[PDB]
Each structure stands twice: as C-alpha cells, then as structure tokens.
Amino acid sequence: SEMTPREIVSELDKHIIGQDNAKRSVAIALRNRWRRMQLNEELRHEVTPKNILMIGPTGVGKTEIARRLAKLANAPFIKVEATKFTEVGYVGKEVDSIIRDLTDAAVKMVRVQAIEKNRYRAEELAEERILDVLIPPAKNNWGQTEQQQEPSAARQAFRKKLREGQLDDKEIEKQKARKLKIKDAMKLLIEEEAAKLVNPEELKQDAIDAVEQHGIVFIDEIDKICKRGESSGPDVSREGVQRDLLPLVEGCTVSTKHGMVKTDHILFIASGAFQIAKPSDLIPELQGRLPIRVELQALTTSDFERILTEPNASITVQYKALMATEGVNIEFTDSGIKRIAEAAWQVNESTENIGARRLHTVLERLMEEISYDASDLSGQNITIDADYVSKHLDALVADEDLSRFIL
Amino acid sequence: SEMTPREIVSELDKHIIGQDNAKRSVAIALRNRWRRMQLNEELRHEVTPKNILMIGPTGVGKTEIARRLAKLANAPFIKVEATKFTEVGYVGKEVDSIIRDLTDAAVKMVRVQAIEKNRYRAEELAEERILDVLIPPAKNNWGQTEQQQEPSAARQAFRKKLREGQLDDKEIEKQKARKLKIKDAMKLLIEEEAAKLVNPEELKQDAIDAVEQHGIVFIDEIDKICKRGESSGPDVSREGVQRDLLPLVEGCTVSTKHGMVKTDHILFIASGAFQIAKPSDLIPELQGRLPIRVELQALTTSDFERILTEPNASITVQYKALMATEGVNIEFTDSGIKRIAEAAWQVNESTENIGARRLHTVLERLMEEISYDASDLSGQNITIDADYVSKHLDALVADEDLSRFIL
Ligand SMILES: Nc1ncnc2c1ncn2[C@@H]1O[C@H](COP(=O)(O)OP(=O)(O)NP(=O)(O)O)[C@@H](O)[C@H]1O
C-alpha cells in the first residue's frame, strides 16, 4: 500500500517547486513499481521498469526531485554523471561501478535501519546486563518448569535505579584505557548488544534485494554522451559510455562487493537539457530503454521569490541569522525579495539560465557591505527593501559583459 | 527430447512477429545441438555447433529471437557489443570476458533454479522449528511414527493458526537462540533451513555444464568491427577483436572464478545491419566460423499492430493488466491500435526508423494521463479508441522536434 500518483506528487510538492509534470512522471514511475509486483508470475517478472529521461536545464530541481522521490519512496539512490565515464582511467569497469557504487550506498542504507529496529535489545539488554548489580536475590533458578516468578528478583524493583540512577563504575556481580560504569555502560552496553543482532547476511541479502529490486539511478548530462557533427573524436568513446550503460539499463547482472545484482528491475532517470543534441541523437537501443520523456520548464521570478524564502532554511534566512550573530539585524522585506528574484532571473535570461544558483551570487553580492561592515554598525536594524536591492544590483544586471564575473 | 524445427518456431512466434527464416535458422541451430548427441562419439566432440550471423535493421527482432530461443531452450545467454573492445581498450583485449560473464549468469541460473526446485521443504522445514518452539514436543518419544501426527491436535491447530496469524515474539535454534518475532524468524529459518540443500560444489559444477553445453552468446554490432582502409589506423585494431573472438567461437577454454569452461559447443550469434560494411568485409576465419547467415527485414505497420496484440504479454496486454491493477479496465480499439502503430511508424518515417522500439514510447505517452489519473478512476471504464490516440499523438507526430525529443 504505497502512495497514489497524486499522493506521491503532494509529498514532492512539499520540498520543491514547479516541474509538476516531472514530479508527476517520476511519481507515476514509483506507482507502477507497485502495480508491477502485483500480477501473475508471467508478467510479474516480465514488465520492464519504465525509465524516465528528464529533459531540462541546470539540475534545477531534477536532481532534487529524483533525490527526494527515492528518499520518501525509501530506496537506494545514486547520482552519476554521464561524462564521468569518458576517457581513460576508469571506463568499462567504471560504467559497471554505477551499480556497485549504489549497491554499497545501499548496504549502508539497509544498515542504518537494520539497527533502528534492533534499537531495543540494545538499551534493554544494556541496562539488564548492568542491572545484575548491587544486591543479588538468591541462587536458585531453573529449578521449576512451571514456577518461576518470585525467586529471581534483583531488578524487580532496581530497574528504576538504573534508568536515571545508573551511575556506578562496577564490573560484575596488556591493553586498558576504558573504565566500565553503569552511567556509561547503559550507553556502552548498547554497542555490545547492538552488535549481536547484526547478521551480515540478513543485511547483505536484504540490501541486494532492496537494490536490484528498488534501484533508482540518476544519469546526469546523458545528453553529453550523444554526439556532435561529422568528425567525432572522443565521442566514438562517448557512445561507448552509452553502450556500456545498456547492460545495466537493458537489465543485466554485475559483480558487486556483496555478491551479484540484477540491473533489470532497476529504475534509471536520464537527465540534462538537450541543446547541442536531442534524445533522438541518443543511441536507439538506449533511446528505447528511456521511455517516459518529461520536459522540464525553466524557472520564473515567482519561483525564485519562493525558494528565496519558502524553504525550511531559505538562503535569506540563515543570512539574517548570520548577520544576527554579528549583533546586527537585517530585515528581508517582501518588497526586496521580489527584486532579489527580479534580479536572479534577469541575469539568467541575459547571461545564461541556471536558476537557484544565481541567487547565492546575487544575494551575497547585494549584501556585500552589510556582511563586511557588521560590527561597524552592530545593534541597529537595517531594511532590505526593493529600493535597497535595485540600488545596488541595478547597474550590474544591465552591464552584461561583467555580470558574467560577479554573478 | 527437444522440439522439432517448427516445434521451436511455433513456441517462438509466441513473442516474435514474422522473420521466421531467422527463427528457422535460430531454430535449426537449437536442433543441431541435440543431433550431435545422436552422432556417435566418433563425431561427437568432433562437430562444431555452427554459429549464426543475423543481418537486419534496427528493432526488428534479432535480440528477442535470441533470448526467446535462449529462454525457450533454458540456457545461460548473454548479449554483448563488440565496440566495448576497441579504441584504447585495455579491456578490449579481454574478449574472453564474454564466457567469464556467460558463466556468471550460468551461476545465477542453476542457483535460483535450485531455490524453487527445492522450496517445498524450504518453507515447511522452516516453520517446523517455529511451531516446535510454539508447542515444545515432549521429551523421549516412543517410536510409532503416527504419534507425531497426534500432537497435531493442538499442533496442526497451531500450524494452521500460523499460516496466517503470526507476529508472535519467540526464540528458536552458529545456530540461533535469539529472541525476535515469528514474522522475521519465519523468513530467517526459511533461509537458514533452506540453503541446507544446495551443494555449492555440485552446484557451481552444475552451472558450468550449462555454459559449457547449453550456453548462448550474442556478439552484437559485429558489423562495426570490420573495415575501410587507405591508412589502416584504427582498422588493425578493430579486426584484432575479431581474431581475439575467434578462439571462443573456434573452441577454447577460459579461466573463471568458477572454473574452466570450453566454448567448444556454444551458440554465438553475431549480428547487426551492414548498411556500410558487409559480412565478406569481416575477417575470413570468422566469416567461416559464421556458417549460418540469415537476413531480417523491416517490420511494417501491419507487423507493428500485430506486435501490440498477438504476442504473449504485448505492451497493451501488459498495460491492460497494468492499468487494471489500479482497478480500471481499458480497451484498445482495432482502429486505435492501428493508430498507435501508424503513429509509431509515422515518427520513424521522419526522424529515425528505430523500428519496434518506437511503439513502447508512442503508447506509453499515449497513456500519460490514464497511467496517472488511475486511482481515482478505480472501477471506471475507458476505451482507447481511434479518436483517443489521434487526440494525444496526432498533435506530436505532426511536428518533428518534439518527436525527436519525446518519442
Ligand atoms: N517480432 C518482433 N519484431 C521486432 N520487435 C519486436 C518483436 N516482438 C517484440 N518486439 C519488441 O521490439 C524490440 C525489438 O528490438 P530487438 O529485440 O533488439 O531487435 P533487434 O533487431 O535485435 N534490434 P537492433 O539491434 O536495434 O536492430 C524488442 O526489444 C521487443 O520489446
């Protein structure tokens, strides 16, 4: 029982922005996963996980979308740059890494949780182990097969004096540099028991599945690998990358550190805005394994204003907070934010679209002085208004052959 | 006994449209494999498997034909693009890798095929101890055999009570003695007391019997590695591969982490469309090692149509069930189907004739909304009629660009 296509989207809508379709498509993909494994043996393992090919500029969300999705969808993710496989050093054995990498990034995942579940027998057996101290009851147990509920009582009223009143430094009822104490034992006896419920197999075999079955790969700049003109050079080695991918894509088995895997039931997400080339130029074989094609729209002034603030920890936020530490306090007005955004955009349009990123520069650049002369004006309060903004930037933005340096 | 020529074919056109000849070829080969078993020892290990070279455009079948056959025959198979062996290929000098890989899967196969071939006990024997911890059998039993079917009074009750209701916190028996939950323990013991019957030795030695005997390879893109001349630069590099491959086809042995395998009798299937080169152009020794040459022709719309239906588990067929999963029946009209096919075809006749591959796209994009707006439809009913396809696709198929982007 997973989230409905729209249900998924909503979750994405939380920490993200536009790219709706994108969210939609990615969502769908997630959904199908369920439908897939919910039929008959024949197709059960005969339906190829539809792979998305994100077609948009500057990892403006796409990167995140994929990230977020796989996260909430709870599954092994992995960002891999296409080009990262072109040229000597690491080629064929490096293309297969993708999996390997992920697989590991998975085995680590399956661990950070395989312990969260057994996070009981740790502190419970960590306290009870050091609970067998102070004043013992008797030494007559296992004598009855139906009567055992009274003799053994060293903690039937001492378990509370080990919760808040643990302390101590006892031991029981060449290398040494650590002292054992119920105060630290209540916390250290955990590392011990937490290492008793860890079966490398129940983790290995667990991850391997939660990978070759729920894998999400994000191939960035896939468009790069495509082609150029007629006298292609490192491209005859580029296409190779593509080819070298097919296997994992088309579905296959690769040798890992914790065994072997199956890249068939895996989900991949190509990416990159195609300017020089197009999905069409892409290698048919692969171009065919990359179904769901989604067009990612640019970013609007509005969008910015949002990312400029909305985020749980906006860039404007932490900044005011940073200025705060300096005793100085700033005021990010809705009047200026618009201008802030109003700027970022202008630049992106004038120079070259990038989105989000543009901000860091435009903001930091506008907040120049303030950042510099802080204690030089500590205490008082400053207003970041639409006029204050333009007052600074205004010029720059206009001067194209320059903005390409400070922004 | 194995299927006669057409006997194979029949089971072959089960997922492939036309191109029978190739099937025949692929079929015959399969048959020969057995004929050899009849040809008395004298000519036993004195007979080549006779390998085939498939020659045809893109997305026309080849591949499938292979697998389908490989599957229909139950034998470790593996596709492989030569290309990943040329141009500064330090690994391209590892053409033997092939078997090393065909053996890897060869491993998986028999293995996984062993888990199912031995799972009737895998589960049973598991829950046993479970129930055994549930109703601890009495000590010292008086041999009567039927006296074990008696505890079933409560036992069976419990057993039946377990094949549904569980999640009880127990503890059972480098063995065990851990206190978890019957849920996990059921699958832990299901495995612990599962791998009891495997025999890694005879197992790993069972797999080789496949790769060595029942094994198939699909040397892909052979056409690439061929010729041109006038300054023999990358030429004496490509051809090389061919030679490097010979031994495998010819018949040699390769070192694998699993042992030694004899490519003597193995089905290698070279292929690719020689729009530029020609089989003749290919190195002779090989040209001669590829005795069976068959041609594949481009699929026509009619074929497409057929492809969207007749084939067992056709896209639509899948999509039908796939949609039905979200509790909603769809219906493609003989007219709509035509459209899809037509659509698909049209695109190929303006951008790139990627053949059959085209469909997957077309359709999937045709079912955009539906695939998304699913949960809500639940119980609803919709027919993908001509006027439907034509509504979504027509628009696209009309203009280029897009198609080259999302098709
Ligand atoms: N009879 C068929 N002819 C063509 N394609 C088919 C057929 N039946 C199913 N298909 C689908 O269409 C695809 C055709 O691609 P493939 O099987 O690689 O053919 P191919 O001729 O080997 N391709 P290529 O190497 O690109 O020329 C398959 O992956 C199937 O999903």
From Swiss-Prot, chains A, B:
Subcellular location: Cytoplasm
Stated family: Belongs to the ClpX chaperone family. HslU subfamily.
GO molecular function: ATP binding; ATP hydrolysis activity; identical protein binding; magnesium ion binding; peptidase activity; proteasome-activating activity; protein domain specific binding
Effect of residue 252 to V: No ATP hydrolysis activity. Binds ATP with lower affinity than wild-type. Can support HslV-mediated proteolysis to some extent
A Gene Ontology BP annotation from the UniProt entry: proteolysis
Induction entry: By heat shock.
Outcome when changing residue 90 to G: Partial loss of protease activity
Protein name: ATP-dependent protease ATPase subunit HslU
Taxonomic superkingdom: Bacteria
